[PDB]
mmCIF file of all heavy atoms in Angstrom:
data_model
loop_
_atom_site.group_PDB
_atom_site.id
_atom_site.type_symbol
_atom_site.label_atom_id
_atom_site.label_comp_id
_atom_site.label_asym_id
_atom_site.label_seq_id
_atom_site.Cartn_x
_atom_site.Cartn_y
_atom_site.Cartn_z
ATOM 1 N N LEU A 143 14.127 9.387 12.225
ATOM 2 C CA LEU A 143 15.566 9.646 12.073
ATOM 3 C C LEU A 143 16.422 8.874 13.116
ATOM 4 O O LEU A 143 15.929 8.569 14.172
ATOM 5 C CB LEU A 143 15.863 11.155 12.073
ATOM 6 C CG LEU A 143 15.186 11.826 10.843
ATOM 7 C CD1 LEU A 143 14.885 13.262 11.142
ATOM 8 C CD2 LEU A 143 16.051 11.650 9.632
ATOM 9 N N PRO A 144 17.692 8.549 12.781
ATOM 10 C CA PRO A 144 18.402 7.530 13.591
ATOM 11 C C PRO A 144 19.024 8.037 14.896
ATOM 12 O O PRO A 144 19.382 9.236 15.004
ATOM 13 C CB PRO A 144 19.497 7.019 12.648
ATOM 14 C CG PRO A 144 19.731 8.174 11.632
ATOM 15 C CD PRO A 144 18.494 9.026 11.619
ATOM 16 N N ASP A 145 19.106 7.128 15.879
ATOM 17 C CA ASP A 145 19.763 7.346 17.165
ATOM 18 C C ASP A 145 21.270 7.277 16.949
ATOM 19 O O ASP A 145 21.742 6.490 16.115
ATOM 20 C CB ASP A 145 19.394 6.209 18.153
ATOM 21 C CG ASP A 145 17.934 6.246 18.604
ATOM 22 O OD1 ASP A 145 17.261 7.278 18.393
ATOM 23 O OD2 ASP A 145 17.465 5.226 19.161
ATOM 24 N N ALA A 146 22.019 8.075 17.715
ATOM 25 C CA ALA A 146 23.478 8.164 17.598
ATOM 26 C C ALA A 146 24.182 7.183 18.557
ATOM 27 O O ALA A 146 25.388 6.956 18.456
ATOM 28 C CB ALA A 146 23.932 9.575 17.893
ATOM 29 N N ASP A 147 23.428 6.620 19.493
ATOM 30 C CA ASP A 147 24.031 5.879 20.622
ATOM 31 C C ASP A 147 23.996 4.373 20.427
ATOM 32 O O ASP A 147 24.132 3.622 21.373
ATOM 33 C CB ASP A 147 23.320 6.251 21.915
ATOM 34 C CG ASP A 147 21.845 5.793 21.951
ATOM 35 O OD1 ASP A 147 21.126 5.767 20.907
ATOM 36 O OD2 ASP A 147 21.378 5.501 23.055
ATOM 37 N N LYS A 148 23.890 3.936 19.186
ATOM 38 C CA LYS A 148 23.624 2.565 18.842
ATOM 39 C C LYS A 148 24.824 1.924 18.129
ATOM 40 O O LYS A 148 25.852 2.563 17.907
ATOM 41 C CB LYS A 148 22.385 2.583 17.939
ATOM 42 C CG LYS A 148 21.107 3.039 18.646
ATOM 43 C CD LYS A 148 20.670 1.965 19.642
ATOM 44 C CE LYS A 148 19.234 2.242 20.110
ATOM 45 N NZ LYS A 148 19.131 3.624 20.656
ATOM 46 N N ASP A 149 24.687 0.661 17.762
ATOM 47 C CA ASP A 149 25.787 -0.113 17.166
ATOM 48 C C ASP A 149 25.571 -0.373 15.658
ATOM 49 O O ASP A 149 24.590 0.131 15.068
ATOM 50 C CB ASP A 149 26.017 -1.407 17.991
ATOM 51 C CG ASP A 149 24.811 -2.367 17.941
ATOM 52 O OD1 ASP A 149 23.853 -2.181 17.136
ATOM 53 O OD2 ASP A 149 24.828 -3.335 18.694
ATOM 54 N N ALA A 150 26.506 -1.114 15.043
ATOM 55 C CA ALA A 150 26.503 -1.470 13.611
ATOM 56 C C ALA A 150 25.248 -2.193 13.123
ATOM 57 O O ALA A 150 24.763 -1.897 12.023
ATOM 58 C CB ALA A 150 27.733 -2.257 13.248
ATOM 59 N N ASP A 151 24.741 -3.129 13.934
ATOM 60 C CA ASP A 151 23.490 -3.825 13.640
ATOM 61 C C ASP A 151 22.299 -2.857 13.525
ATOM 62 O O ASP A 151 21.488 -3.010 12.627
ATOM 63 C CB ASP A 151 23.174 -4.911 14.711
ATOM 64 C CG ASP A 151 24.224 -6.008 14.785
ATOM 65 O OD1 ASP A 151 25.030 -6.169 13.839
ATOM 66 O OD2 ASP A 151 24.241 -6.757 15.808
ATOM 67 N N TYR A 152 22.189 -1.901 14.467
ATOM 68 C CA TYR A 152 21.175 -0.878 14.431
ATOM 69 C C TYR A 152 21.258 -0.028 13.146
ATOM 70 O O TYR A 152 20.237 0.209 12.493
ATOM 71 C CB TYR A 152 21.258 0.030 15.663
ATOM 72 C CG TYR A 152 20.384 1.286 15.537
ATOM 73 C CD1 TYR A 152 19.077 1.289 16.013
ATOM 74 C CD2 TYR A 152 20.876 2.472 14.929
ATOM 75 C CE1 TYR A 152 18.267 2.421 15.902
ATOM 76 C CE2 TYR A 152 20.088 3.590 14.807
ATOM 77 C CZ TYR A 152 18.768 3.558 15.298
ATOM 78 O OH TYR A 152 17.934 4.648 15.199
ATOM 79 N N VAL A 153 22.465 0.449 12.820
ATOM 80 C CA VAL A 153 22.711 1.289 11.637
ATOM 81 C C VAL A 153 22.343 0.505 10.376
ATOM 82 O O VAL A 153 21.691 1.062 9.460
ATOM 83 C CB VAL A 153 24.206 1.756 11.538
ATOM 84 C CG1 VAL A 153 24.444 2.595 10.276
ATOM 85 C CG2 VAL A 153 24.632 2.543 12.772
ATOM 86 N N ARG A 154 22.748 -0.772 10.319
ATOM 87 C CA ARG A 154 22.436 -1.608 9.145
ATOM 88 C C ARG A 154 20.928 -1.779 8.943
ATOM 89 O O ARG A 154 20.401 -1.556 7.848
ATOM 90 C CB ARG A 154 23.114 -2.960 9.249
ATOM 91 C CG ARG A 154 22.937 -3.841 8.011
ATOM 92 C CD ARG A 154 23.959 -4.968 8.019
ATOM 93 N NE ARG A 154 25.327 -4.558 7.678
ATOM 94 C CZ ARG A 154 26.393 -4.603 8.486
ATOM 95 N NH1 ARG A 154 26.284 -5.014 9.754
ATOM 96 N NH2 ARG A 154 27.582 -4.258 8.017
ATOM 97 N N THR A 155 20.248 -2.184 10.007
ATOM 98 C CA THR A 155 18.802 -2.297 10.013
ATOM 99 C C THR A 155 18.111 -0.974 9.718
ATOM 100 O O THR A 155 17.169 -0.955 8.929
ATOM 101 C CB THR A 155 18.289 -2.872 11.330
ATOM 102 O OG1 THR A 155 18.921 -4.145 11.564
ATOM 103 C CG2 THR A 155 16.767 -3.023 11.318
ATOM 104 N N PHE A 156 18.540 0.099 10.397
ATOM 105 C CA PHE A 156 17.948 1.421 10.196
ATOM 106 C C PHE A 156 17.917 1.789 8.695
ATOM 107 O O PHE A 156 16.869 2.169 8.145
ATOM 108 C CB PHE A 156 18.631 2.531 11.033
ATOM 109 C CG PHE A 156 18.091 3.879 10.720
ATOM 110 C CD1 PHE A 156 16.972 4.372 11.405
ATOM 111 C CD2 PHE A 156 18.635 4.634 9.649
ATOM 112 C CE1 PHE A 156 16.404 5.608 11.036
ATOM 113 C CE2 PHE A 156 18.079 5.867 9.267
ATOM 114 C CZ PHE A 156 16.965 6.370 9.972
ATOM 115 N N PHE A 157 19.064 1.640 8.028
ATOM 116 C CA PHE A 157 19.200 2.136 6.686
ATOM 117 C C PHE A 157 18.444 1.287 5.665
ATOM 118 O O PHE A 157 18.093 1.784 4.597
ATOM 119 C CB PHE A 157 20.659 2.427 6.323
ATOM 120 C CG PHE A 157 21.114 3.803 6.751
ATOM 121 C CD1 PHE A 157 21.940 3.981 7.894
ATOM 122 C CD2 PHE A 157 20.702 4.929 6.035
ATOM 123 C CE1 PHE A 157 22.358 5.281 8.306
ATOM 124 C CE2 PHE A 157 21.097 6.218 6.435
ATOM 125 C CZ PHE A 157 21.935 6.401 7.572
ATOM 126 N N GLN A 158 18.133 0.041 6.028
ATOM 127 C CA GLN A 158 17.304 -0.823 5.189
ATOM 128 C C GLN A 158 15.943 -0.221 4.889
ATOM 129 O O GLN A 158 15.413 -0.442 3.807
ATOM 130 C CB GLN A 158 17.143 -2.221 5.802
ATOM 131 C CG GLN A 158 18.406 -3.070 5.674
ATOM 132 C CD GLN A 158 18.399 -4.337 6.508
ATOM 133 O OE1 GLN A 158 19.374 -5.103 6.476
ATOM 134 N NE2 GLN A 158 17.355 -4.544 7.298
ATOM 135 N N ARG A 159 15.380 0.535 5.839
ATOM 136 C CA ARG A 159 14.110 1.261 5.653
ATOM 137 C C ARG A 159 14.215 2.373 4.564
ATOM 138 O O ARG A 159 13.198 2.729 3.962
ATOM 139 C CB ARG A 159 13.634 1.875 6.995
ATOM 140 C CG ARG A 159 12.121 2.054 7.096
ATOM 141 C CD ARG A 159 11.718 3.153 8.100
ATOM 142 N NE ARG A 159 12.153 4.498 7.674
ATOM 143 C CZ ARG A 159 12.799 5.383 8.434
ATOM 144 N NH1 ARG A 159 13.098 5.095 9.704
ATOM 145 N NH2 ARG A 159 13.158 6.567 7.918
ATOM 146 N N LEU A 160 15.427 2.898 4.350
ATOM 147 C CA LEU A 160 15.721 3.944 3.334
ATOM 148 C C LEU A 160 16.262 3.316 2.059
ATOM 149 O O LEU A 160 16.758 4.041 1.163
ATOM 150 C CB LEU A 160 16.736 4.970 3.894
ATOM 151 C CG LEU A 160 16.246 5.849 5.043
ATOM 152 C CD1 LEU A 160 17.375 6.819 5.521
ATOM 153 C CD2 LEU A 160 14.947 6.666 4.654
ATOM 154 N N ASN A 161 16.178 1.979 1.978
ATOM 155 C CA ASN A 161 16.671 1.175 0.840
ATOM 156 C C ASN A 161 18.166 1.363 0.530
ATOM 157 O O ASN A 161 18.595 1.314 -0.631
ATOM 158 C CB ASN A 161 15.744 1.276 -0.442
ATOM 159 C CG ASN A 161 16.199 0.307 -1.560
ATOM 160 O OD1 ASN A 161 16.457 -0.865 -1.296
ATOM 161 N ND2 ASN A 161 16.305 0.802 -2.788
ATOM 162 N N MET A 162 18.968 1.517 1.596
ATOM 163 C CA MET A 162 20.417 1.729 1.501
ATOM 164 C C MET A 162 21.172 0.470 1.968
ATOM 165 O O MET A 162 20.806 -0.124 2.982
ATOM 166 C CB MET A 162 20.839 2.937 2.357
ATOM 167 C CG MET A 162 20.250 4.277 1.898
ATOM 168 S SD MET A 162 20.789 4.692 0.212
ATOM 169 C CE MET A 162 19.836 6.203 -0.052
ATOM 170 N N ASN A 163 22.157 0.041 1.177
ATOM 171 C CA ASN A 163 22.997 -1.066 1.513
ATOM 172 C C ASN A 163 24.278 -0.594 2.253
ATOM 173 O O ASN A 163 24.419 0.576 2.570
ATOM 174 C CB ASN A 163 23.305 -1.929 0.277
ATOM 175 C CG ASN A 163 24.212 -1.218 -0.755
ATOM 176 O OD1 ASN A 163 24.939 -0.290 -0.458
ATOM 177 N ND2 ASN A 163 24.177 -1.708 -1.962
ATOM 178 N N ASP A 164 25.196 -1.518 2.527
ATOM 179 C CA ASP A 164 26.382 -1.185 3.343
ATOM 180 C C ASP A 164 27.241 -0.087 2.673
ATOM 181 O O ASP A 164 27.630 0.894 3.309
ATOM 182 C CB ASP A 164 27.250 -2.405 3.557
ATOM 183 C CG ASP A 164 26.688 -3.399 4.578
ATOM 184 O OD1 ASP A 164 25.566 -3.242 5.144
ATOM 185 O OD2 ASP A 164 27.455 -4.390 4.785
ATOM 186 N N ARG A 165 27.562 -0.284 1.397
ATOM 187 C CA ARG A 165 28.345 0.719 0.662
ATOM 188 C C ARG A 165 27.714 2.123 0.709
ATOM 189 O O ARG A 165 28.415 3.130 0.953
ATOM 190 C CB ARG A 165 28.562 0.297 -0.796
ATOM 191 C CG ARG A 165 29.296 -1.010 -0.956
ATOM 192 C CD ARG A 165 29.695 -1.214 -2.408
ATOM 193 N NE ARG A 165 30.593 -0.147 -2.835
ATOM 194 C CZ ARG A 165 31.914 -0.146 -2.660
ATOM 195 N NH1 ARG A 165 32.521 -1.156 -2.043
ATOM 196 N NH2 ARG A 165 32.627 0.884 -3.108
ATOM 197 N N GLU A 166 26.396 2.164 0.528
ATOM 198 C CA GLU A 166 25.649 3.419 0.522
ATOM 199 C C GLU A 166 25.642 4.088 1.890
ATOM 200 O O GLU A 166 25.828 5.288 1.985
ATOM 201 C CB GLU A 166 24.218 3.201 0.032
ATOM 202 C CG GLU A 166 24.158 2.765 -1.425
ATOM 203 C CD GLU A 166 22.810 2.214 -1.836
ATOM 204 O OE1 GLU A 166 22.161 1.433 -1.104
ATOM 205 O OE2 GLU A 166 22.383 2.576 -2.925
ATOM 206 N N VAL A 167 25.438 3.290 2.939
ATOM 207 C CA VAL A 167 25.431 3.759 4.312
ATOM 208 C C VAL A 167 26.828 4.356 4.645
ATOM 209 O O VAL A 167 26.922 5.477 5.174
ATOM 210 C CB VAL A 167 25.078 2.570 5.313
ATOM 211 C CG1 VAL A 167 25.403 2.949 6.748
ATOM 212 C CG2 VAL A 167 23.627 2.116 5.153
ATOM 213 N N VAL A 168 27.900 3.604 4.321
ATOM 214 C CA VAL A 168 29.291 4.056 4.593
ATOM 215 C C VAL A 168 29.627 5.338 3.795
ATOM 216 O O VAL A 168 30.240 6.291 4.348
ATOM 217 C CB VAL A 168 30.326 2.936 4.399
ATOM 218 C CG1 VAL A 168 31.778 3.485 4.659
ATOM 219 C CG2 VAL A 168 29.977 1.778 5.383
ATOM 220 N N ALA A 169 29.210 5.360 2.521
ATOM 221 C CA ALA A 169 29.378 6.582 1.696
ATOM 222 C C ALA A 169 28.636 7.786 2.296
ATOM 223 O O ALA A 169 29.247 8.843 2.520
ATOM 224 C CB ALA A 169 28.976 6.343 0.230
ATOM 225 N N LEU A 170 27.341 7.638 2.567
ATOM 226 C CA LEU A 170 26.554 8.727 3.193
ATOM 227 C C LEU A 170 27.173 9.326 4.457
ATOM 228 O O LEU A 170 27.273 10.551 4.616
ATOM 229 C CB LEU A 170 25.131 8.258 3.455
ATOM 230 C CG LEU A 170 24.272 8.185 2.162
ATOM 231 C CD1 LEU A 170 22.973 7.439 2.423
ATOM 232 C CD2 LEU A 170 24.024 9.560 1.495
ATOM 233 N N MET A 171 27.609 8.445 5.372
ATOM 234 C CA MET A 171 28.136 8.884 6.635
ATOM 235 C C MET A 171 29.330 9.777 6.549
ATOM 236 O O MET A 171 29.572 10.537 7.470
ATOM 237 C CB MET A 171 28.499 7.658 7.558
ATOM 238 C CG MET A 171 28.182 7.978 8.952
ATOM 239 S SD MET A 171 26.459 7.685 9.181
ATOM 240 C CE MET A 171 26.544 5.835 9.124
ATOM 241 N N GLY A 172 30.113 9.637 5.491
ATOM 242 C CA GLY A 172 31.260 10.483 5.277
ATOM 243 C C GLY A 172 30.945 11.965 5.140
ATOM 244 O O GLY A 172 31.872 12.768 5.169
ATOM 245 N N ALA A 173 29.654 12.320 5.050
ATOM 246 C CA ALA A 173 29.211 13.726 5.169
ATOM 247 C C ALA A 173 29.533 14.325 6.541
ATOM 248 O O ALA A 173 29.609 15.548 6.682
ATOM 249 C CB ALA A 173 27.685 13.873 4.837
ATOM 250 N N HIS A 174 29.759 13.466 7.544
ATOM 251 C CA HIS A 174 30.193 13.923 8.871
ATOM 252 C C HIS A 174 31.485 14.696 8.888
ATOM 253 O O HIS A 174 31.661 15.537 9.739
ATOM 254 C CB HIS A 174 30.204 12.797 9.920
ATOM 255 C CG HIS A 174 28.840 12.445 10.405
ATOM 256 N ND1 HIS A 174 28.518 11.217 10.933
ATOM 257 C CD2 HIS A 174 27.691 13.160 10.390
ATOM 258 C CE1 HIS A 174 27.238 11.208 11.271
ATOM 259 N NE2 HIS A 174 26.717 12.377 10.946
ATOM 260 N N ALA A 175 32.378 14.452 7.945
ATOM 261 C CA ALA A 175 33.561 15.323 7.794
ATOM 262 C C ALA A 175 33.259 16.816 7.703
ATOM 263 O O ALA A 175 34.132 17.641 8.004
ATOM 264 C CB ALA A 175 34.387 14.895 6.573
ATOM 265 N N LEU A 176 32.033 17.168 7.295
ATOM 266 C CA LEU A 176 31.647 18.578 7.050
ATOM 267 C C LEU A 176 31.547 19.520 8.270
ATOM 268 O O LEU A 176 32.096 20.641 8.247
ATOM 269 C CB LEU A 176 30.326 18.655 6.270
ATOM 270 C CG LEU A 176 30.450 18.255 4.802
ATOM 271 C CD1 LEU A 176 29.136 18.484 4.029
ATOM 272 C CD2 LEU A 176 31.602 19.010 4.150
ATOM 273 N N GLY A 177 30.847 19.080 9.316
ATOM 274 C CA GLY A 177 30.538 19.975 10.403
ATOM 275 C C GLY A 177 30.908 19.419 11.764
ATOM 276 O O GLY A 177 31.997 18.853 11.958
ATOM 277 N N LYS A 178 29.978 19.566 12.710
ATOM 278 C CA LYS A 178 30.242 19.259 14.103
ATOM 279 C C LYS A 178 28.921 18.979 14.809
ATOM 280 O O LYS A 178 27.823 19.266 14.290
ATOM 281 C CB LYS A 178 30.999 20.401 14.803
ATOM 282 C CG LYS A 178 30.136 21.612 15.148
ATOM 283 C CD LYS A 178 30.930 22.741 15.794
ATOM 284 C CE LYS A 178 31.285 22.454 17.273
ATOM 285 N NZ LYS A 178 30.064 22.458 18.139
ATOM 286 N N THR A 179 29.034 18.349 15.974
ATOM 287 C CA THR A 179 27.875 18.114 16.807
ATOM 288 C C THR A 179 27.876 19.287 17.774
ATOM 289 O O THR A 179 28.950 19.839 18.080
ATOM 290 C CB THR A 179 27.992 16.768 17.570
ATOM 291 O OG1 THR A 179 29.243 16.773 18.234
ATOM 292 C CG2 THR A 179 27.982 15.581 16.636
ATOM 293 N N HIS A 180 26.701 19.664 18.269
ATOM 294 C CA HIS A 180 26.562 20.799 19.167
ATOM 295 C C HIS A 180 25.803 20.308 20.376
ATOM 296 O O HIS A 180 24.707 19.799 20.234
ATOM 297 C CB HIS A 180 25.762 21.946 18.520
ATOM 298 C CG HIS A 180 26.261 22.367 17.166
ATOM 299 N ND1 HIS A 180 25.884 21.735 16.001
ATOM 300 C CD2 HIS A 180 27.102 23.363 16.795
ATOM 301 C CE1 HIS A 180 26.472 22.318 14.972
ATOM 302 N NE2 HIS A 180 27.207 23.317 15.427
ATOM 303 N N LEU A 181 26.396 20.440 21.573
ATOM 304 C CA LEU A 181 25.819 19.831 22.749
ATOM 305 C C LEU A 181 24.334 20.189 22.935
ATOM 306 O O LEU A 181 23.521 19.307 23.253
ATOM 307 C CB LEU A 181 26.638 20.166 24.000
ATOM 308 C CG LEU A 181 26.440 19.174 25.159
ATOM 309 C CD1 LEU A 181 27.165 17.871 24.898
ATOM 310 C CD2 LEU A 181 26.900 19.791 26.463
ATOM 311 N N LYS A 182 23.962 21.461 22.716
ATOM 312 C CA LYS A 182 22.554 21.875 22.849
ATOM 313 C C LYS A 182 21.603 21.278 21.816
ATOM 314 O O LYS A 182 20.409 21.185 22.072
ATOM 315 C CB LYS A 182 22.418 23.408 22.834
ATOM 316 C CG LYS A 182 22.912 24.108 24.111
ATOM 317 N N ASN A 183 22.094 20.864 20.653
ATOM 318 C CA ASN A 183 21.164 20.276 19.682
ATOM 319 C C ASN A 183 20.944 18.804 19.919
ATOM 320 O O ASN A 183 19.819 18.306 19.802
ATOM 321 C CB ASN A 183 21.674 20.421 18.246
ATOM 322 C CG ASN A 183 21.688 21.851 17.760
ATOM 323 O OD1 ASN A 183 21.034 22.726 18.321
ATOM 324 N ND2 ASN A 183 22.457 22.090 16.733
ATOM 325 N N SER A 184 22.033 18.088 20.200
ATOM 326 C CA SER A 184 22.001 16.632 20.102
ATOM 327 C C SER A 184 22.562 15.887 21.329
ATOM 328 O O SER A 184 22.431 14.676 21.415
ATOM 329 C CB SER A 184 22.729 16.180 18.837
ATOM 330 O OG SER A 184 24.106 16.512 18.914
#
Side-chain angles (χ1 to χ4, degrees), residues 143-181 183-184:
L143 296 153
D145 291 346
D147 66 326
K148 294 290 193 305
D149 65 10
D151 298 343
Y152 169 92
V153 178
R154 185 163 285 116
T155 304
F156 175 88
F157 275 103
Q158 286 168 180
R159 207 204 66 229
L160 293 179
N161 186 47
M162 296 299 176
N163 69 22
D164 285 3
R165 300 191 61 85
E166 295 166 317
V167 166
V168 178
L170 285 168
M171 217 82 72
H174 284 155
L176 287 186
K178 76 182 284 292
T179 52
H180 308 85
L181 202 75
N183 292 342
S184 65

